[PDB]
Amino acid sequence: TLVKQLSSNFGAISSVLNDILARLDPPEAEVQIDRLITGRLQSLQTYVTQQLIRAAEIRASANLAATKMSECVLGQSKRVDFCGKGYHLMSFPQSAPHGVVFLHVTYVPAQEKNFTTAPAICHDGKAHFPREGVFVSNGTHWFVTQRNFYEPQIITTHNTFVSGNCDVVIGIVNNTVYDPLQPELDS
Amino acid sequence: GVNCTEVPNVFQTRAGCLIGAEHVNNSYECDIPIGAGICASYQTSQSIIAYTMSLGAENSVAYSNNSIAIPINFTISVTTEILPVSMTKTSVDCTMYICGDSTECSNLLLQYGSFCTQ
Amino acid sequence: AIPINFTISVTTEILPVSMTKTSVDCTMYICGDSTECSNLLLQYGSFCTQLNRALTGIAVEQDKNTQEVFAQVKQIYKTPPIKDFGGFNFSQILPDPSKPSKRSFIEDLLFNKVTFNGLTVLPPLLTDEMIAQYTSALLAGTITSGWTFGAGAALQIPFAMQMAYRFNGIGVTQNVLYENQKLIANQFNSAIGKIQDSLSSTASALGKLQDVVNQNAQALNTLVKQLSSNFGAISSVLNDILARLDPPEAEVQIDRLITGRLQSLQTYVTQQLIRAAEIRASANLAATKMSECVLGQSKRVDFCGKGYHLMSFPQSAPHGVVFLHVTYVPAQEKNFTTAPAICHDGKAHFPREGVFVSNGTHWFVTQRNFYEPQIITTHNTFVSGNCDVVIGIVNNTVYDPLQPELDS
Ligand SMILES: *[C@@H]1O[C@H](CO)[C@@H](O[C@@H]2O[C@H](CO)[C@@H](O)[C@H](O)[C@H]2NC(C)=O)[C@H](O)[C@H]1NC(C)=O
Ligand SMILES: *[C@@H]1O[C@H](CO)[C@@H](O[C@@H]2O[C@H](CO)[C@@H](O)[C@H](O)[C@H]2NC(C)=O)[C@H](O)[C@H]1NC(C)=O
Ligand SMILES: *[C@@H]1O[C@H](CO)[C@@H](O[C@@H]2O[C@H](CO)[C@@H](O)[C@H](O)[C@H]2NC(C)=O)[C@H](O)[C@H]1NC(C)=O
Ligand SMILES: *[C@@H]1O[C@H](CO)[C@@H](O[C@@H]2O[C@H](CO)[C@@H](O)[C@H](O)[C@H]2NC(C)=O)[C@H](O)[C@H]1NC(C)=O
Ligand SMILES: *[C@@H]1O[C@H](CO)[C@@H](O)[C@H](O)[C@H]1NC(C)=O
Ligand SMILES: *[C@@H]1O[C@H](CO)[C@@H](O)[C@H](O)[C@H]1NC(C)=O
Ligand SMILES: *[C@@H]1O[C@H](CO)[C@@H](O)[C@H](O)[C@H]1NC(C)=O
């Protein structure tokens, strides 16, 4: 568009400047050249202004790209949905023509399956909560998995702790909590 | 944006008049956007069809007070993201663009202050 | 100093997301229904289709924004019939069957607060019902599924456990919740109502998205009010010049008017172009404040509201979006003497995750943000070395659980 604006007329009798200077010597060449100069100058100013605004856009995007390359690549961002959709593992940058491209590796849980649960467990009066994990039941027995992977294992005292008495927790469930120390006592 | 009784099947949208597009009654993830929830697309003997866009398949999560779902499997998914970082470094000279080897124009341009240096 | 009690607070944040679309014809504005302004305007070059190309770019991005903000979910979840969520009732942010346009008791008092010359006003791509349905899907997917409807499919989890496993992020344990469920529930209910009161009483908060419609109507007013200005010519009414001066005097007069009107229109387009950059800057902040605060649990400080952020709910608003950050601000304090390490039988028992504190005679090992003092055992402390290098070491006794068991 900036180039094409040169062929325009703007009110003079011609657009090509030499021909104007090749037909009209003393003042009237100048009265036409005034119009030519005004028009061309305004077109140039407009072009410069949108260039400035577009450059601001690009710089905002480039700062975003710099942040992504600093956080996704070198470390391991916990900011959800920042570096990909799911749980972030790694990333591998790739060049691109006037840009950069990332390759977000991501863990994605699937193949769900539902169990009845329980916030805690009474046993001999004291309500046991899980250290890390959740309580579940496979229909008849109660286990303690982790969050994102059904890897059940026997409830014990090395993975559950004690707080108070099961009178205020709402939704308590009876069970027995296994002590590894008891079997190894007859020596 | 014209009540299209006043124009030279024929659908009457909230954003104007859409002539030459069938108003189907089902809903899809839309291809070509128009406005006010109306999109158009090419599908099935073929023709063009306009409708109201959809947002997604319904899902009623069976929420109970003592039930939790725990995944049994994972699946590593690798995706892509593209971002611009720079644009070409273009520079323009004022005097060549405005006058162009035409000193009798540069003398006049002199009077206009300093609309080259900035 | 270690807190004894806590308070739950439900603040508010308001951001603008998108302007109102517009599109201005060139020659209907410059030359209002005239033909003697065809010759006198084809002279100037590609001005018209520059102005008619910047405006559509703005118009399309102003609608890309509202689709990048609210359309981060993939499916439309719905709650079960009424409610069961422990003691928390979201009975006044959730949609209701009444009021045909599905909309909740808060984003209704938000909509009841901000109540042609060559100018056209195009409609938005997403009507006010579709945004309200997105903000209800994102609301029914977090009340029922927690962290994990942004990762993949939505996994159910009872709400009590959701709120309990959200504390374990900010630092406090889960017993702290389960023995204080009633307190936290009735603190949360009697903190949502203050938002209703504050929003209904005055328009104090919704200024951020009101001084935007109050600024896009100043430029749009000046643009049409500068049609009545001679700009340095005999008249401003086009037909009057067209009639009074037939010879090539109308050329110079109409050139003066055309230059004036073209300059005014160009300086309107430039102002819109600049003003549409900060709107996108705020729309890009809404997207990353709604990915992180809503669909997760941010550990950044002061980002999702002051305090320890643990939940949040989105609520729509006219050309905007409103959050309802929930935080965990501790309360009434005490003061205790402390020690960097105990010293039992030559070694130095550091605390696993906590702080040793005292009362004058006893010692304990508590958390950070609550005061539940256990008893120092070799299940709360890990031994490292000897008892001289540490500065501030104290000497005490450290209980061992297996010892009072061998006797029987
Ligand atoms: C899941 O529940 C099933 C019952 O439906 C358990 O099956 C029995 O578990 C007992 C444990 O004391 C075993 O002695 C039995 O041999 C099991 N049954 C069979 C047919 O082998 C099962 O153990 C539970 N899951 C786990 C991991 O224990
Ligand atoms: C879990 O088991 C305990 C003990 O087996 C039950 O405690 C009962 O409590 C009531 C009132 O405190 C007593 O009258 C009973 O004698 C206790 N024992 C039994 C076997 O009932 C407790 O009720 C059980 N949990 C539930 C939900 O019933
Ligand atoms: C979880 O939901 C079930 C719904 O079945 C609740 O079960 C109800 O319990 C009350 C009182 O115990 C009974 O009067 C109802 O008859 C039960 N429902 C049915 C369909 O029989 C259960 O109470 C809920 N969990 C908690 C902790 O209240
Ligand atoms: C988790 O998903 C993978 C698929 O990615 C399952 O792998 C399949 O396992 C079955 C059973 O051994 C094989 O017959 C298939 O050939 C495997 N397919 C692939 C593509 O690996 C894996 O078994 C799943 N895990 C569980 C516990 O079911
Ligand atoms: C798991 O969910 C399905 C429906 O989503 C339900 O029919 C089934 O009974 C649930 N399983 C258990 C053990 O509750
Ligand atoms: C268009 O004009 C007719 C004439 O009365 C009217 O009946 C119709 O409702 C108008 N269209 C719309 C969309 O209002
Ligand atoms: C869709 O079908 C229903 C059923 O008759 C009708 O009421 C409605 O007007 C139809 N909509 C369109 C766009 O054809």
Residue numbers in the entry:
A (entry chain A): 961 to 1147
B (entry chain A): 614 to 621, 641 to 676, 689 to 762
C (entry chain B): 713 to 827, 855 to 1147
Cite, word for word, the article reporting this structure.
The rapid spread of B.1.1.7 has increased concern about those natural mutations in the S protein, including 69–70 deletion, 144 deletion, N501Y, A570D, D614G, P681H, T716I, S982A, and D1118H. To determine the structural basis for the enhanced infectivity mediated by the S protein of the dominant SARS-CoV-2 B.1.1.7 variant, we used cryo-electron microscopy (cryo-EM) single-particle analysis (SPA) to solve the structures of B1.1.7 S in the 1-RBD-up state and the B1.1.7 S-hACE2 complex with resolutions of 3.7 and 4.1 Å, respectively, according to the gold standard Fourier shell correlation (FSC) coefficient of 0.143. To improve protein stability for cryo-EM data processing, proline substitutions at K986 and V987 and a “GSAS” substitution at the furin cleavage site (S1/S2 site, R682 to R685) were introduced into the purified S protein, according to a previous report.
Ten point mutations were identified in the S protein of SARS-CoV-2 B.1.1.7 compared to the WT S protein. They are scattered in different locations throughout the trimeric structure in the prefusion state. Among the mutations, the 69HV70 and Y144 deletions in the N-terminal domain (NTD), as well as the P681H mutation near the furin cleavage site, could not be traced in the cryo-EM map because they are located in the flexible loop region. The remaining six sites could be identified in both the S and S-ACE2 structures. Despite these deletions and mutations, the overall structure of SARS-CoV-2 B.1.1.7 S changed little compared with that of WT S. In the two structures, the most stable region with the highest local resolution is the helical bundle of the S2 subunit, consistent with the previous reports. For the A570 in the C-terminal domain (CTD) of the S1 subunit, the D570 substitution generates a new hydrogen bond to K964 in the S2 subunit of the other protomer, improving the overall stability of the S-trimer. In addition, the G614 residue does not participate in the original interactions of D614 with other residues, such as the D614-K854 salt bridge, which may help to prevent premature dissociation of the G614 trimer, as recently reported. Similarly, the T716I and S982A substitutions abrogate the original interactions of T716 and S982, respectively, with the related residues, suggesting local destabilizing effects for increasing the propensity for the “up” RBD conformation. Finally, the D1118H substitution forms a symmetric histidine triad that may help stabilize the S-trimer through water-mediated interactions.
